Design a protein around this motif. Structure first.
Motif, short mmCIF file in Angstrom:
data_model
loop_
_atom_site.label_atom_id
_atom_site.label_comp_id
_atom_site.label_asym_id
_atom_site.label_seq_id
_atom_site.Cartn_x
_atom_site.Cartn_y
_atom_site.Cartn_z
N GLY A 124 66.41 9.18 72.57
CA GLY A 124 66.37 7.79 72.87
C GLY A 124 65.26 7.06 72.15
O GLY A 124 65.42 5.90 71.77
N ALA A 127 65.85 9.88 66.03
CA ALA A 127 65.94 9.60 67.44
C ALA A 127 65.55 10.84 68.23
O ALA A 127 66.13 11.91 68.06
CB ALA A 127 67.35 9.14 67.82
N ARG A 128 64.55 10.70 69.03
CA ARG A 128 64.09 11.76 69.87
C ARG A 128 64.44 11.39 71.31
O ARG A 128 63.66 10.71 72.00
CB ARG A 128 62.57 11.94 69.70
N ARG A 129 65.66 11.74 71.70
CA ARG A 129 66.21 11.53 73.04
C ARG A 129 66.10 10.06 73.47
O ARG A 129 65.70 9.74 74.60
CB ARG A 129 65.52 12.41 74.07
#
Length: 18
Positions: free
Chosen positions: A1, A16-18
């Motif tokens: 996100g 994008a990291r979660r």
């Protein structure tokens, strides 16, 4: 996100990291 941009050995990648 959460979009974090990481540069690593000449490569800059926005990822994008979660």
């Amino acid at each position: 996100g959460v979009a974090r941009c990481v540069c690593r050995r000449g490569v800059c990648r926005c990822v994008a990291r979660r």
